[PDB]
Amino acid sequence: EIVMTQSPATLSVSPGERATLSCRASQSVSSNLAWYQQKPGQAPRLLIYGASTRATGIPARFSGSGSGTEFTLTISSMQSEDFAVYYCHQYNNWWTFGQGTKVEIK
Amino acid sequence: ENLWVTVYYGVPVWKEAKTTLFCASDAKAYETHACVPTDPNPQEMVLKNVTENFNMWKNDMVDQMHEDVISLWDQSLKPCVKLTPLCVTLNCTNATASNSSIIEGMKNCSFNITTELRDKREKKNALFYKLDIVQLDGNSSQYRLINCNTSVITQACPKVSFDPIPIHYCAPAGYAILKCNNKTFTGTGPCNNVSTVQCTHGIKPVVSTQLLLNGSLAEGEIIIRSENITKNVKTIIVHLNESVKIECTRPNNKTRTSIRIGPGQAFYATGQVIGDIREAYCNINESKWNETLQRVSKKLKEYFPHKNITFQPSSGGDLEITTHSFNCGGEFFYCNTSSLFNRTYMANNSTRTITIHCRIKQIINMWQEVGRAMYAPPIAGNITCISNITGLLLTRDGGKNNTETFRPGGGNMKDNWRSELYKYKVVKIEPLGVAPTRCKRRV
Amino acid sequence: NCNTSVITQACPKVSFDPIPIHYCAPAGYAILKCNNKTFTGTGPCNNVSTVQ
Amino acid sequence: TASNSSIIEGMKNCSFNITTELRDKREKKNALFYKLDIVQLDGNSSQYRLI
Amino acid sequence: VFLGFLGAAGSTMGAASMTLTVQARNLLSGIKQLQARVLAVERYLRDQQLLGIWGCSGKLICCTNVPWNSSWSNRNLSEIWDNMTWLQWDKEISNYTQIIYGLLEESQNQQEKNEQDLLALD
Amino acid sequence: VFLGFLGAAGSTMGAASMTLTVQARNLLSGIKQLQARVLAVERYLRDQQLLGIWGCSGKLICCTNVPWNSSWSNRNLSEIWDNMTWLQWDKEISNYTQIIYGLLEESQNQQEKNEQDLLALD
Amino acid sequence: VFLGFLGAAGSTMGAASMTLTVQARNLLSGIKQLQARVLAVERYLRDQQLLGIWGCSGKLICCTNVPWNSSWSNRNLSEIWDNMTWLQWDKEISNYTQIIYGLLEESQNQQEKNEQDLLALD
């Protein structure tokens, strides 16, 4: 039922710059939200499972924050390898996935 | 000004901690199972102004109950025989008894076995359920015992005869067991009618799925309990305030026939069945069942705002969850409940009996773990057991829009004990405190 | 005895023998003893003694 | 069977008979052992046993 | 065998002084059983001997030396002394209990100095 | 290891007044052995702490409140005080020992009330 | 968990009187683990109750009856009281410790004799 939308579709980021990705939901998801990273070819990867709790091994330059119906992931010291696609995911009801946000070199 | 420390002993203040619990029970048992001391003279008290937190889905002694009930079986199965020599390739006829439907393997399955003199191998035969054996490839006459592929089957000693004897859990001095009495408590969050004891009310360690038995009822109206971290709940527990009587019976005459593996082991099997064959079945009162489902339908839409509520019977898994699983006497029953959870309801005294056909199998992949496996010996004569359900184990499901579905599930038997140990919490007391007062010691 | 029992062999190193055994009871308890030489084994004594 | 042979000696294609799940069915198998794990049986130079 | 094990619920600081007696009584009367016994003894002695450090010995209540620092709990408890129960104060003072125990220990320490220095004359 | 458990056999109610120390000293020094040890402790403490609740603490004899009763044993023991031994008395008062223990407990209770109500002035 | 076992090393007979308070505290907090626990209790009680028979009860130091003797250690320890540490004295007196313990017991004995023979007049 819950549709989740991820904006903006694209972000152009020169290396070493900070980036911000926003995720919104048709209905509330409280804090049952997570952020995954997709590298084309390989398998998606976990970034943040709670609204902000970082999973093991991810660089500290990643962090997400939000609640209710609005959330935002952010990266502060982005490196070249971080350039990939991203997805926001929710699990407060039948879980679903957002269309995702691209990030490209500038 | 002029405040001096004074130490008090025997203070009433407590905290939350783990601890080791011990058994108490009735005066007699079949012999932590018989255990000591005896069920004492009960005592209780109310703490009035205390407002205290409770949690059902995290507390400890549920896990202690499970860790007991496993090792407590294994404390009894080991001395009995171990059926490893019996896994020989079984050749089966399946057609001597014209009443051929249910019991499949039959005599006149046949196999080779080793007698007292290790040289002398002999031929024997017995009867097995088709749910006990699996087919070897190709040769239609070749079959094997089901669980010999990956476990060392063992036979419950026929003298044991488990039964849900009540068990009281008691905590050692210095600790205590808090109890919540507010009739509307939903399994998590504060209570403000706390009480304390040193021994819980007798728990009955039943094991059953899709609906639980012999439990102690709820004192308010039919309650529903669930985890609350997410609306995507693994299991939903429905605790009833009125008990519906269910009787289940097996009509035939089983004939216990003994075989020998020397030096000193006797392996009991099912011989020729006598009397005309019929399928074991379970009964319910239609009126009471309809009323109970009506009440649960009313209550369930407390949590879910206005959607239509539809039940559906299970749709996958082993027989442990595709049917109602339980035990009577020395047999285990698996009852096809596809005709019960079939109602539907929209938003906005004991006549007629529902019968459900119920198969039985001997080799139980004991519900707690792999590696182990138990063979329940046959029981002669017809069998009946009355019982009374007290709660349902549901799980939510989709397949419809603006209409939630539900199905029986919850084979994870831990929930059963969590359906009766939610009241209680275990606390460590710290009777020693300090305070200020107007006094300091005279030398 | 192979008909109904699982025979086992006493280890040859063991070599039992009626070594004397003293029985002692824990503190707080005691062992009463009757010394009357004619005590027939049931009924009162009146030359009691106590030990541990 | 492996031209690079020296170290590990006992090898496949040591072969033996073992008892499978159905206690009747006895099957042939083979594996590789170090020559320090096995000892030679007298006479029949192709027969070896676990040490 | 037990009773009145926490009946003092709802009483205030000193108002709970009476029943302290009974709540300090209860110790009376397959392997887990054995464990449960040992704990009962240990958890008792670790409290009983601890009072010995502080010089209170076999008393439920007892004054002592050292002032109740208005520090620790930067507070006065007299004005709430009749309208709160113990927990809300034990949890409040937890910040400094570990220190206060050492203070009471030292309070007891000087007692034997003061006693010997006088008794050695007889 | 022990010291003369029950040499006091044959003494009367009071004649065993001061052989008590030896009767009280004795605690000194195949899983049954382990069990035998634990009992020795639990039995001792269950007695030692009991005297605590009665306020006698570390004394073999001690007066107290709560007078003797024409109730309980409807008897006077003074006139047999020198020609009987302890058992014949203990087996008689058994009808009321459980009550008398609570009476002694309550006797001890008021002591701390009376002490604090006076000591709070210093 | 513990607190300063033996910082008193190097102190003399009496100069080690201060930190005694600390030396008496330490009891705080795969079957061997179980055994290690039981020992800690039995060793403690066997000492704690022992002082009871000697009448010292819950005190680190205490006078008593039964004067010192030319017998036992045929010595005066006043002259060495400030230039010897405990071991050299304990190992010297070992010859008569077992006797002196009984003497201390008998010293404690007469106490309650005298006390009752005076209190019974109340």
GROMACS .gro file of C-alpha atoms in nm, chain B residues 81-318:
model
  238
  187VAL     CA    1   1.682  -4.791   2.302
  188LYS     CA    2   1.829  -4.636   1.986
  189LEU     CA    3   1.687  -4.769   1.661
  190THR     CA    4   1.993  -4.738   1.436
  191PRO     CA    5   1.996  -5.110   1.342
  192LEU     CA    6   1.637  -5.079   1.217
  193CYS     CA    7   1.706  -4.862   0.911
  194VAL     CA    8   1.742  -5.165   0.685
  195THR     CA    9   1.566  -5.139   0.348
  196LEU     CA   10   1.199  -5.212   0.409
  197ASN     CA   11   1.008  -5.414   0.149
  198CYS     CA   12   0.638  -5.335   0.180
  199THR     CA   13   0.320  -5.505   0.058
  200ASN     CA   14   0.052  -5.248   0.152
  201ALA     CA   15  -0.243  -5.468   0.055
  202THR     CA   16  -0.323  -5.738   0.315
  203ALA     CA   17  -0.590  -5.536   0.499
  204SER     CA   18  -0.875  -5.460   0.259
  205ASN     CA   19  -0.920  -5.147   0.470
  206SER     CA   20  -0.606  -5.037   0.292
  207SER     CA   21  -0.634  -4.658   0.292
  208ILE     CA   22  -0.457  -4.508   0.590
  209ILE     CA   23  -0.190  -4.731   0.740
  210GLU     CA   24   0.002  -4.827   0.423
  211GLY     CA   25   0.294  -5.051   0.520
  212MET     CA   26   0.174  -5.390   0.639
  213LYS     CA   27   0.262  -5.753   0.700
  214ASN     CA   28   0.213  -6.069   0.495
  215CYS     CA   29   0.663  -5.394   0.571
  216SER     CA   30   0.917  -5.676   0.593
  217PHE     CA   31   1.288  -5.651   0.670
  218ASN     CA   32   1.600  -5.824   0.802
  219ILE     CA   33   1.709  -5.776   1.164
  220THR     CA   34   1.977  -5.913   1.396
  221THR     CA   35   1.873  -6.133   1.688
  222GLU     CA   36   2.046  -6.219   2.016
  223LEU     CA   37   2.312  -6.436   1.849
  224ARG     CA   38   2.486  -6.179   1.633
  225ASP     CA   39   2.529  -6.438   1.358
  226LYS     CA   40   2.159  -6.518   1.325
  227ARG     CA   41   1.979  -6.271   1.102
  228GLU     CA   42   1.602  -6.311   1.078
  229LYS     CA   43   1.301  -6.173   0.894
  230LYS     CA   44   1.033  -5.964   1.064
  231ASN     CA   45   0.747  -5.735   0.970
  232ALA     CA   46   0.529  -5.463   1.121
  233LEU     CA   47   0.291  -5.181   1.029
  234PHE     CA   48   0.396  -4.820   0.970
  235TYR     CA   49   0.217  -4.505   0.864
  236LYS     CA   50   0.289  -4.378   0.515
  237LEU     CA   51   0.394  -4.055   0.688
  238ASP     CA   52   0.667  -4.252   0.866
  239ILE     CA   53   0.833  -4.402   0.557
  240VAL     CA   54   0.967  -4.256   0.234
  241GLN     CA   55   1.003  -4.425  -0.102
  242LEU     CA   56   1.333  -4.538  -0.246
  243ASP     CA   57   1.379  -4.457  -0.612
  244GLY     CA   58   1.243  -4.694  -0.874
  245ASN     CA   59   1.161  -5.015  -0.689
  246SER     CA   60   0.802  -4.946  -0.586
  247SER     CA   61   0.827  -5.204  -0.308
  248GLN     CA   62   1.126  -5.043  -0.133
  249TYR     CA   63   1.079  -4.796   0.153
  250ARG     CA   64   1.285  -4.654   0.437
  251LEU     CA   65   1.215  -4.494   0.773
  252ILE     CA   66   1.173  -4.124   0.715
  253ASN     CA   67   1.422  -3.962   0.948
  254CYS     CA   68   1.709  -4.211   0.929
  255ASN     CA   69   1.861  -3.996   0.655
  256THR     CA   70   1.994  -3.740   0.903
  257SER     CA   71   1.923  -3.836   1.266
  258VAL     CA   72   1.959  -4.115   1.521
  259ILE     CA   73   1.602  -4.217   1.600
  260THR     CA   74   1.526  -4.318   1.957
  261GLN     CA   75   1.223  -4.470   2.126
  262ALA     CA   76   1.044  -4.308   2.417
  263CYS     CA   77   1.048  -4.556   2.702
  264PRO     CA   78   0.690  -4.688   2.731
  265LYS     CA   79   0.696  -4.639   3.110
  266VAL     CA   80   0.735  -4.260   3.086
  267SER     CA   81   0.401  -4.130   2.956
  268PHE     CA   82   0.450  -3.755   2.972
  269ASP     CA   83   0.154  -3.532   3.056
  270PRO     CA   84   0.123  -3.157   3.112
  271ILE     CA   85   0.181  -3.172   3.487
  272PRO     CA   86   0.166  -2.816   3.627
  273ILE     CA   87   0.498  -2.650   3.710
  274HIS     CA   88   0.548  -2.358   3.948
  275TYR     CA   89   0.857  -2.144   3.892
  276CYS     CA   90   1.020  -2.002   4.204
  277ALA     CA   91   1.311  -1.761   4.240
  278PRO     CA   92   1.581  -1.766   4.509
  279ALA     CA   93   1.581  -1.535   4.809
  280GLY     CA   94   1.696  -1.181   4.744
  281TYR     CA   95   1.505  -1.177   4.415
  282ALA     CA   96   1.131  -1.169   4.357
  283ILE     CA   97   0.871  -1.214   4.084
  284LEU     CA   98   0.658  -0.912   4.000
  285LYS     CA   99   0.312  -0.968   3.857
  286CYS     CA  100   0.070  -0.737   3.673
  287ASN     CA  101  -0.300  -0.765   3.753
  288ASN     CA  102  -0.457  -0.493   3.536
  289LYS     CA  103  -0.697  -0.700   3.329
  290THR     CA  104  -0.641  -0.497   3.011
  291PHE     CA  105  -0.259  -0.513   2.999
  292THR     CA  106  -0.153  -0.569   2.637
  293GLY     CA  107   0.177  -0.747   2.698
  294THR     CA  108   0.408  -0.445   2.701
  295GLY     CA  109   0.422  -0.112   2.880
  296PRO     CA  110   0.348   0.017   3.227
  297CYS     CA  111   0.120  -0.141   3.485
  298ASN     CA  112  -0.006   0.028   3.801
  299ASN     CA  113  -0.169  -0.256   3.995
  300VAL     CA  114   0.157  -0.440   4.057
  301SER     CA  115   0.188  -0.732   4.297
  302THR     CA  116   0.479  -0.948   4.407
  303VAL     CA  117   0.529  -1.316   4.482
  304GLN     CA  118   0.802  -1.577   4.509
  305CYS     CA  119   0.630  -1.846   4.301
  306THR     CA  120   0.424  -1.817   3.984
  307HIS     CA  121   0.087  -1.979   3.933
  308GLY     CA  122   0.110  -2.331   3.799
  309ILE     CA  123   0.206  -2.336   3.432
  310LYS     CA  124   0.104  -2.633   3.219
  311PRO     CA  125   0.380  -2.708   2.963
  312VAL     CA  126   0.156  -2.803   2.672
  313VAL     CA  127   0.287  -2.811   2.315
  314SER     CA  128   0.043  -2.742   2.033
  315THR     CA  129   0.004  -2.523   1.726
  316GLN     CA  130  -0.274  -2.328   1.556
  317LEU     CA  131  -0.452  -2.312   1.892
  318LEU     CA  132  -0.331  -2.388   2.243
  319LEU     CA  133  -0.484  -2.606   2.512
  320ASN     CA  134  -0.550  -2.637   2.885
  321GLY     CA  135  -0.416  -2.288   2.952
  322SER     CA  136  -0.547  -2.048   3.213
  323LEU     CA  137  -0.803  -1.806   3.075
  324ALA     CA  138  -0.803  -1.428   3.056
  325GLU     CA  139  -1.003  -1.249   3.323
  326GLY     CA  140  -1.123  -0.953   3.116
  327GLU     CA  141  -1.275  -0.995   2.773
  328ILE     CA  142  -1.093  -1.172   2.491
  329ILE     CA  143  -0.755  -1.001   2.466
  330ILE     CA  144  -0.523  -0.972   2.166
  331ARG     CA  145  -0.147  -0.935   2.205
  332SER     CA  146   0.129  -0.852   1.962
  333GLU     CA  147   0.470  -0.700   1.931
  334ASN     CA  148   0.459  -0.325   1.879
  335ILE     CA  149   0.792  -0.226   1.722
  336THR     CA  150   0.622  -0.262   1.382
  337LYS     CA  151   0.279  -0.340   1.248
  338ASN     CA  152   0.450  -0.626   1.059
  339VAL     CA  153   0.412  -0.882   1.338
  340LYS     CA  154   0.553  -1.234   1.323
  341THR     CA  155   0.279  -1.380   1.544
  342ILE     CA  156  -0.043  -1.253   1.703
  343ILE     CA  157  -0.171  -1.419   2.020
  344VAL     CA  158  -0.543  -1.427   2.099
  345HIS     CA  159  -0.615  -1.502   2.465
  346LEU     CA  160  -0.972  -1.611   2.536
  347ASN     CA  161  -1.202  -1.550   2.831
  348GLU     CA  162  -1.420  -1.855   2.763
  349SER     CA  163  -1.317  -2.212   2.690
  350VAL     CA  164  -1.459  -2.425   2.408
  351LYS     CA  165  -1.451  -2.800   2.466
  352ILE     CA  166  -1.273  -3.011   2.202
  353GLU     CA  167  -1.270  -3.392   2.216
  354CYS     CA  168  -1.052  -3.600   1.987
  355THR     CA  169  -1.066  -3.975   1.943
  356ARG     CA  170  -0.898  -4.266   1.763
  357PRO     CA  171  -1.138  -4.562   1.734
  358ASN     CA  172  -0.931  -4.861   1.624
  359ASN     CA  173  -0.760  -5.132   1.830
  360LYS     CA  174  -0.384  -5.111   1.787
  361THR     CA  175  -0.193  -5.426   1.878
  362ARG     CA  176   0.145  -5.370   2.041
  363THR     CA  177   0.386  -5.634   1.910
  364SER     CA  178   0.737  -5.664   2.052
  365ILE     CA  179   1.055  -5.727   1.854
  366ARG     CA  180   1.414  -5.759   1.973
  367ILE     CA  181   1.726  -5.590   1.842
  368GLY     CA  182   1.990  -5.866   2.202
  369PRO     CA  183   2.158  -5.770   2.416
  370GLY     CA  184   1.880  -5.612   2.623
  371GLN     CA  185   1.666  -5.385   2.406
  372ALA     CA  186   1.301  -5.437   2.315
  373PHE     CA  187   1.156  -5.243   2.021
  374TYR     CA  188   0.778  -5.205   2.018
  375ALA     CA  189   0.589  -5.183   1.689
  376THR     CA  190   0.231  -5.192   1.567
  377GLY     CA  191   0.104  -5.540   1.481
  378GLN     CA  192  -0.214  -5.638   1.304
  379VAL     CA  193  -0.500  -5.393   1.358
  380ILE     CA  194  -0.829  -5.545   1.474
  381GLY     CA  195  -1.176  -5.403   1.423
  382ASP     CA  196  -1.320  -5.217   1.129
  383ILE     CA  197  -1.111  -4.918   1.029
  384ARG     CA  198  -1.205  -4.552   1.067
  385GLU     CA  199  -1.021  -4.221   1.079
  386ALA     CA  200  -0.944  -4.038   1.404
  387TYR     CA  201  -1.144  -3.718   1.441
  388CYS     CA  202  -1.205  -3.407   1.651
  389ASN     CA  203  -1.530  -3.235   1.755
  390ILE     CA  204  -1.636  -2.875   1.824
  391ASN     CA  205  -1.969  -2.707   1.904
  392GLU     CA  206  -2.077  -2.499   1.605
  393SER     CA  207  -2.257  -2.239   1.816
  394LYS     CA  208  -1.965  -2.184   2.051
  395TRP     CA  209  -1.713  -2.171   1.767
  396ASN     CA  210  -1.921  -1.921   1.573
  397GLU     CA  211  -1.960  -1.705   1.882
  398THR     CA  212  -1.587  -1.716   1.958
  399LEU     CA  213  -1.496  -1.614   1.606
  400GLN     CA  214  -1.753  -1.335   1.626
  401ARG     CA  215  -1.593  -1.204   1.945
  402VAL     CA  216  -1.243  -1.223   1.799
  403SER     CA  217  -1.365  -1.044   1.488
  404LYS     CA  218  -1.504  -0.767   1.706
  405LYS     CA  219  -1.186  -0.729   1.908
  406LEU     CA  220  -0.938  -0.758   1.623
  407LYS     CA  221  -1.058  -0.439   1.453
  408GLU     CA  222  -0.948  -0.244   1.757
  409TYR     CA  223  -0.596  -0.236   1.616
  410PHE     CA  224  -0.694  -0.225   1.249
  411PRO     CA  225  -0.921   0.071   1.186
  412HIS     CA  226  -1.207  -0.024   0.956
  413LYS     CA  227  -1.104  -0.303   0.717
  414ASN     CA  228  -1.303  -0.619   0.662
  415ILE     CA  229  -1.160  -0.916   0.852
  416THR     CA  230  -1.130  -1.251   0.674
  417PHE     CA  231  -0.978  -1.573   0.804
  418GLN     CA  232  -0.818  -1.841   0.589
  419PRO     CA  233  -0.664  -2.179   0.675
  420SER     CA  234  -0.291  -2.231   0.654
  421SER     CA  235  -0.133  -2.284   0.313
  422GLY     CA  236   0.221  -2.417   0.353
  423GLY     CA  237   0.476  -2.592   0.568
  424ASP     CA  238   0.518  -2.928   0.729
   0.00000   0.00000   0.00000
